[PDB]
Amino acid sequence: XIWIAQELRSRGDSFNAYYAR
Amino acid sequence: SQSNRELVVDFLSYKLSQKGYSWSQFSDVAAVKQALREAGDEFELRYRRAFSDLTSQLHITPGTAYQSFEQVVNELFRDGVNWGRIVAFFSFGGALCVESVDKEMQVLVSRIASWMATYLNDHLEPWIQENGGWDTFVDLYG
Ligand SMILES: [Cl-]
Ligand SMILES: [Cl-]
């Protein structure tokens, strides 16, 4: 895992927020 | 779907190669490919610590590997899909593959590749096609 998925999700989202059109 | 499988193999092969491991030895079995490689490189460099967390907290073994993979990916995508989460997904599988080889569980490489391609084709493809397919990804991340 829960914590590992959470880490990946939050970082994926920050990455997404920067690059999203 | 065959193009998706080929995308998974391209990424995993690249990430293995960066660690000095060849696809031909360790698997028992173009603009999009390049964008994903670059996005993967950037994601992993920027959040290196998250990937050491993964290999320290989860001791993969062939018997528990599938259940653990599916639990991580299901939680990752629990409330939706976006490009950032997709990049995290590819990077996660890449890390798992390299970890498997380091730990002498290299039979898992082709299995992880299969689990990723299945998840991509069944569960991520609907969102990807609804959002302009992989060419859109190339636009934003290439
Ligand atoms: Cl941490
Ligand atoms: Cl959630």
Side-chain angles (χ1 to χ4, degrees):
Chain A
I2 295 171
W3 161 57
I4 293 303
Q6 287 185 111
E7 290 205 305
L8 284 174
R9 193 174 62 239
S10 86
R11 285 152 181 79
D13 286 344
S14 165
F15 211 72
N16 189 69
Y18 189 57
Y19 293 113
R21 185 141 167 204
Chain B
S1 82
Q2 200 184 61
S3 64
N4 277 337
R5 220 275 165 176
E6 166 183 328
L7 192 63
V8 172
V9 170
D10 179 83
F11 191 86
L12 298 179
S13 172
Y14 176 61
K15 261 54 189 60
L16 280 178
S17 75
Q18 291 175 315
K19 296 311 216 182
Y21 296 139
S22 79
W23 188 253
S24 63
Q25 286 200 329
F26 292 104
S27 165
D28 44 71
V29 186
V32 180
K33 286 176 191 181
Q34 180 66 359
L36 200 53
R37 290 184 179 202
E38 292 166 356
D41 285 337
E42 182 182 356
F43 195 80
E44 296 152 20
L45 177 65
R46 171 71 180 86
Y47 303 112
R48 189 183 177 192
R49 178 168 194 93
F51 297 90
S52 303
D53 284 336
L54 164 77
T55 67
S56 309
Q57 165 70 79
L58 300 182
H59 288 5
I60 310 300
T61 68
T64 57
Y66 179 77
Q67 182 177 73
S68 184
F69 173 89
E70 294 295 329
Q71 179 176 4
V72 170
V73 179
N74 284 342
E75 202 71 63
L76 170 55
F77 293 111
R78 122 127 46 207
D79 62 343
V81 182
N82 58 47
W83 290 117
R85 290 171 180 202
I86 293 181
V87 170
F89 162 84
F90 275 90
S91 288
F92 164 68
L96 247 35
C97 284
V98 176
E99 185 196 351
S100 292
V101 179
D102 287 333
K103 289 170 59 72
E104 295 194 347
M105 298 161 184
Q106 60 266 24
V107 72
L108 295 176
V109 175
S110 73
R111 291 195 216 167
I112 294 159
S114 177
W115 306 335
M116 291 176 72
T118 295
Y119 194 89
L120 176 53
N121 274 327
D122 296 9
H123 303 302
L124 271 10
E125 246 308 308
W127 184 89
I128 289 167
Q129 72 156 235
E130 167 186 29
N131 284 263
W134 283 102
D135 266 10
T136 302
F137 181 79
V138 177
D139 263 80
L140 308 186
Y141 291 84

